């Protein structure tokens, strides 16, 4: 505290604090006849002393401090977000008082003299008070008097006060509680309850205690966001440093506890050096509760009875300190927003310490406390299923915490009601198809957060959702089979689209830091072992593959011999993210587009800045293993040249998102994505359309890009490529990878190239092989550049320069100013000898494939190696073809004529929904030539032809096997 007024223009953001850790500390204070003030060192919040105020009923003391109270506008301009001037303090009652403390503000007040507020005094321990001076009083520039007036209707009493403060605070976070009414309130949890109720029986009580034990087992037997500490020496040393001591007639003294979000009220960056030094003695709650949790785990595992006893005493003393510091029911502490970051491991520690809390008589207080602070999470904790219940962040950061809270409920019947309701809640959350872009699982196996498929968020949700189902398994509280089934689909999907990292196109705002299925491994074991008929051999086989365990290891784990899964093979469509996966031997190809329902990229203030082309009809090839080891290196990466994309090559200043903060650029039509045939073959259809008027986006940049994938190969074709500038700098990238000693060789037309730098130009009938064993045969292009070169780039978070050596090849479309095009073919198992054979087949009247149509309405590719035909109907059309005659909607159709059968698949990758609306099925009429008889697809012979009726729900292909009618 300084001679300056509160909210002084020298530094408006500089808090004034009466902590009394200074020379002459009651200088600014005056008491009437019926009040006495002293410093006590018995307890304190900031510094070693607090103000002891002995009073008779209705007496006052006054703090003489000039306040230049800012407007909310002024406070907000001074900090840079919505703000208000706040008055705050802490007070301690050793005994409850049946009445109100009155705080008045005005000019030259004495005992007997504008605006003010009430604090209810019916409590013990520390409480915080915090009000907006502009919004929460019932303030003229002349205020110099803050009068603290004891209750009238109570004849005498005693209150400790510390850390009287004037500060600028976030205008969201002065919360009402049982002591003070503010303009803001976070209402208490109101638990939902499902009927019929399970009875309290020995069996249902035993099931509840088993679930608690199963949770203990998971936390004492490797968690992200848990700073595990198993060394007891270190735990004792961190605990002793808290300087906690029990006080004679109750409470503790010890270092003040504060959350990471509570510190904002001080404006720590602007504190005077004297206050900063006292503020620096605080303990961050997250660290404290992590310590409580590490002690609780140590205590469960401890075999030495003396140490075990000490570890319990440390946990219970930490608990007593936390409660006396005011972390109790009906105590807002001004705010506790983002509560989970501060308390997640407190919830869990209560499971481990549940008998110790019972015996110590703390269980009711800790339950009441945690329930009150959980009110932030009311939309999930109330357990009424809603469109928002499938929240993937909840599954990661809160679900086990929610269960822990319920299990801490002291009444047996209410506990069983809560966990029965919890089981129904989780079943509905994991079953329902949320509408529009709301978080959660989807029917093609995608899993959404931030309004799209998002592995970076779904992977931790899968881990902890599987674990929850496993914790509840084989009890009256087990998750419904519908939730198990839906989660299995999402987790088998993740196994298919990861190798073991998800490709660059699925990286979200974290390109080159893809999530890995390795982090989700245990979830596969948990889901396998929680099947109705356990173990689920598919999920068990995947757990062994991802965790690198042998068949020999399987019996001990699953209780039967299970062969580790081989890598999935074939083609899988995932229109939830307008992608598909082609798998052959150990390679995965992520084919990815975007549309109205699928954002191209997520770009934040400091993430993915150059991600514009993340979904530009990419086809990233990944062999099983580290993407970085395969040359997907961020340093020097040309962000223009994402593999398979057609792009405008831009300077990074122009490729950077034009929004300073967030851009999730959606596409201009519903249709773009993939389809599948027989689980083996795929097609991508990508209609590249830019916005009419978004800065840095050329409104005339267009392309039609199709890919047909089968067996060891993919056929890429493009047409109708254009830009505002005659295709200047318009390119299609074949590949890009870093050059390293293990990734040092290219082949071009049978010649090994290792020189750096190196450039050359290829055309139709030429071929290359990248260092990853991918062959590229150029089948229609006038100009294909190949480069081995030093590149300069910038990192996707802070735009800081980077550099690296790269091999790349791209098609230069500037040779064709209007309606540029390309064709090329990729061989996944290329060798120089096989590429020689493929080039010869191409020269033999193209024995590889045939493009039957390549225009703005339809692309049709006949694959002569696989005998499969893909039809990308960018527009409904009638066509001339042996099999397909007409399609009445934008669609992807595929055919395979084998022996006595024609197999036809159809879909629209359009999910037929909005950010708000549920997806509804699209009916597609596909007329095929000739008379056929035969799947949910309906058919009807109509003259010489056969009408097939497909139902495309959420971009999920359907297929039918037809045979010819005489
Ligand atoms: C603020 C912003 O850019 N985006 C909001 C999301 O915030 C990010 O994502 C998450 C997250 O857990 O999903 C946490 C961090 O705040 C941000 O990295 C997110 O907001 S929220 O979860 O923080 O409330 C979503 C909520 O659906 O909204 C984005 O706008
Ligand atoms: C999409 C996303 O940001 N997910 C969050 C995680 O972030 C990814 O994983 C990690 C990681 O090692 O945790 C780091 C990178 O930020 C991302 O690759 C992760 O967030 S954070 O704590 O790492 O900032 C988790 C933490 O709860 O939240 C993810 O889901
Ligand atoms: C003006 C407008 O609607 N812009 C849209 C964005 O929303 C704004 O920006 C952000 C931000 O994090 O940058 C948050 C607020 O919602 C708005 O101030 C944003 O839409 S959304 O994702 O927030 O729904 C983007 C997504 O591309 O669309 C903006 O341009
Ligand atoms: Mg003090």
UniProtKB/Swiss-Prot annotation:
It is found in: Periplasm. Optimum pH is 8. Is essentially inactive at pH 9.0. Na(+) binds at residues 19, 46, 49, 162. One of its GO terms (cellular component) is extracellular region. Its EC number is 4.2.2.20. Is inhibited by Zn(2+), Ni(2+), Fe(2+) and Cu(2+). GO terms for biological process: carbohydrate metabolic process; glycosaminoglycan catabolic process. Changing residue 661 to A: Still active on both chondroitin 6-sulfate and dermatan sulfate, but with reduced catalytic efficiency. The active site is at residues 450, 457. The record marks 509 as: Transition state stabilizer. Induction: By chondroitin sulfate or its degraded products. Gene3D superfamilies: 2.70.98.10, Chondroitin AC/alginate lyase, Galactose-binding lectin, Polysaccharide lyase family 8-like, C-terminal. Its main location: periplasm. The record marks 602 as: Important for catalytic activity. Optimum temperature is 37 degrees Celsius. SUPFAM superfamilies: Chondroitin AC/alginate lyase, Galactose mutarotase-like, Galactose-binding domain-like, Hyaluronate lyase-like, C-terminal domain. It holds the Pfam family Lyase_8. InterPro entries: Chondroitin_ABC_lyase, Chondroitin_lyas, Chondroitinase_ABC_I, Gal_mutarotase_sf_dom, Galactose-bd-like_sf, GH-type_carb-bd, Lyase_8-like_C, Lyase_8_C. Keywords: Calcium, Carbohydrate metabolism, Lyase, Metal-binding, Periplasm, Signal, Sodium. Consists of three domains. The middle domain contains the catalytic site in a wide-open cleft. Endolytic, broad-specificity glycosaminoglycan lyase, which degrades the polysaccharides chondroitin, chondroitin-4-sulfate, chondroitin-6-sulfate, dermatan sulfate and to a lesser extent hyaluronan, by beta-elimination of 1,4-hexosaminidic bond to unsaturated tetrasaccharides and disaccharides. Is not active against keratan sulfate, heparan sulfate, and heparin. Is able to promote functional recovery in the injured central nervous system (CNS), via its role in the disruption of the normal organization of the extracellular matrix (ECM). This is Chondroitin sulfate ABC endolyase.
């Amino acid at each position: 505290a300084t001679s300056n007024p509160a909210f002084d223009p020298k530094n408006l953001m500089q808090s004034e604090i009466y902590h009394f850790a200074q020379n002459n500390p009651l200088a600014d204070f005056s008491s009437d006849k019926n009040s006495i003030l002293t410093l006590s060192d018995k307890r304190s919040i900031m510094g070693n002393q607090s103000l002891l105020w002995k009073w008779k009923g209705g007496s006052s003391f006054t703090l003489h401090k000039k306040l230049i109270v800012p407007t909310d506008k002024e406070a907000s301009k001074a900090w840079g977000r919505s703000s208000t001037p706040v008055f705050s303090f802490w007070l301690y009652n050793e005994k409850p008082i049946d009445g109100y403390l009155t705080i008045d503000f005005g000019e030259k007040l004495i005992s007997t003299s504008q605006a003010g507020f009430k604090v209810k005094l019916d409590f013990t321990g520390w409480r915080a008070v915090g009000v907006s001076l502009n919004n929460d009083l019932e303030l003229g520039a002349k205020v110099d008097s803050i009068r603290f007036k004891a209750p009238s209707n109570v004849s005498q009493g005693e209150i400790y006060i510390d850390r009287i403060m004037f500060s600028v605070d976030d205008a969201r976070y002065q919360w009402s509680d049982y002591q003070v009414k503010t303009r803001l309130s976070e209402p208490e949890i109101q638990f939902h309850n499902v009927k019929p109720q399970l009875p309290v029986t020995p069996e249902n009580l035993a099931a509840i205690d088993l679930i608690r034990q199963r949770l203990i087992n998971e936390f004492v037997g490797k968690e992200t966001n848990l700073a595990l500490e198993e060394n007891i020496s270190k735990l004792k040393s961190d605990f002793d440093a808290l300087n906690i001591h029990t006080l004679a007639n109750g409470g503790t003294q010890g270092r003040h506890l504060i959350t990471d979000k509570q510190i904002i009220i001080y404006q720590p960056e602007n504190l005077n050096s004297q206050d900063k030094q006292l503020f620096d003695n605080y303990v961050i709650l997250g660290n404290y509760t992590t310590l409580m949790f590490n002690i609780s785990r140590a205590y469960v595992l401890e075999k030495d009875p003396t140490q075990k006893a000490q570890l319990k005493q440390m946990y219970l003393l930490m608990t007593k300190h936390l409660l006396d510091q005011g972390f109790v029911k009906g105590s807002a502490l001004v705010t506790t927003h983002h509560w989970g970051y501060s308390s997640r491991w407190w919830y869990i520690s209560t499971l481990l310490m549940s008998d110790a809390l019972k015996e110590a008589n703390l269980q009711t207080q800790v339950y009441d406390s945690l329930l009150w602070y959980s009110r932030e999470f009311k939309s999930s904790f109330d357990m009424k299923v809603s469109a928002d219940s499938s929240d993937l962040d909840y599954f990661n950061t809160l679900s086990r915490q929610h269960l822990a809270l319920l299990l801490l409920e002291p009444d047996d019947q209410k506990r069983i009601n809560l966990v029965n309701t919890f089981s129904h809640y989780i079943t509905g959350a994991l079953t329902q198809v949320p509408p529009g872009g709301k978080d959660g699982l989807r029917p093609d196996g995608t899993a959404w957060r931030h309004e799209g498929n998002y592995p970076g968020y779904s992977f931790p949700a899968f881990k902890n959702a599987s674990q929850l189902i496993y914790l509840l398994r084989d009890t009256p509280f087990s998750v419904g089979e519908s939730g198990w089934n839906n989660l299995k689909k999402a987790m088998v999907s993740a196994w298919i689209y990861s190798n073991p990292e998800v490709g660059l196109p699925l990286a979200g705002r974290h390109p080159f830091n893809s999530p890995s299925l390795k982090s989700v491994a245990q979830g596969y074991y948990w889901l396998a072992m929680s099947a109705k008929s356990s173990p689920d051999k598919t999920l068990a086989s995947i757990y062994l593959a991802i965790s690198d365990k042998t068949q020999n290891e399987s019996t001990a784990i699953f209780g039967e011999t299970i062969t580790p899964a081989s890598l999935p093979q074939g083609f899988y469509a995932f229109n939830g993210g307008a992608f598909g996966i082609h798998r052959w031997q150990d390679k995965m190809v992520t084919l990815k587009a975007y549309n109205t329902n699928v954002w191209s990229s997520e770009i934040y203030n400091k993430d993915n800045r150059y991600g514009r082309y993340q979904s530009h009809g990419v086809a990233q090839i990944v062999s099983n293993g580290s993407q970085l080891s395969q040359g997907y290196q961020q340093e020097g990466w040309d962000w223009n040249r994402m593999q398979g994309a057609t792009t405008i090559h831009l300077p990074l200043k122009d490729l950077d998102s034009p929004k300073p903060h967030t851009l999730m650029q959606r596409g201009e039509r519903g249709f773009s994505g993939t389809s599948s045939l027989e689980g083996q073959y795929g097609m991508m259809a990508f209609d590249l359309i830019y916005p009419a008027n978004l800065e840095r986006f050329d409104p005339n940049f267009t392309a039609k890009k199709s890919v047909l994938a089968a067996d060891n190969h993919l056929i890429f074709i493009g047409s109708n490529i254009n830009s505002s500038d005659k295709n200047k700098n318009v390119e299609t990238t074949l590949f890009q990878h870093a050059i390293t000693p293990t990734l040092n060789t290219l082949w071009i037309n049978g010649q090994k190239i290792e020189n750096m730098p190196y450039q050359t130009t290829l055309q139709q009938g030429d071929w290359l092989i990248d260092s990853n064993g991918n062959g590229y045969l150029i089948t229609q292009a006038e100009k294909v550049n190949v480069s081995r070169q030093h590149q300069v780039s910038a990192e996707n978070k802070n735009r800081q320069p980077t550099e690296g050596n790269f091999s790349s090849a791209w098609i230069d479309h500037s040779t064709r100013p209007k309606d540029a095009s390309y064709e090329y073919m990729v061989f996944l198992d290329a060798t120089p000898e096989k590429m020689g054979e493929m080039a010869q087949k191409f020269r033999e009247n193209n024995g590889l494939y045939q493009v039957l149509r390549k225009d703005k309405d339809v692309h049709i590719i006949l694959d002569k190696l696989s005998n499969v035909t893909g039809y990308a109907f960018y527009q409904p059309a009638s066509i001339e073809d042996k099999w397909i005659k007409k399609v009445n909607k934008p669609a992807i159709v595929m055919t395979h004529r084998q022996k006595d059968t024609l197999i036809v698949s159809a879909v629209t990758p359009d999910l037929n929904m909005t950010r708000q609306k549920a997806a509804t099925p699209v009916t597609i009429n596909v007329t095929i030539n000739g008379k056929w008889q035969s799947s949910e697809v309906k058919y009807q012979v109509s003259g010489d032809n056969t009408e097939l009726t497909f139902t495309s729900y959420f971009g999920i292909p359907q297929e039918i096997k037809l045979s010819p009618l005489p």
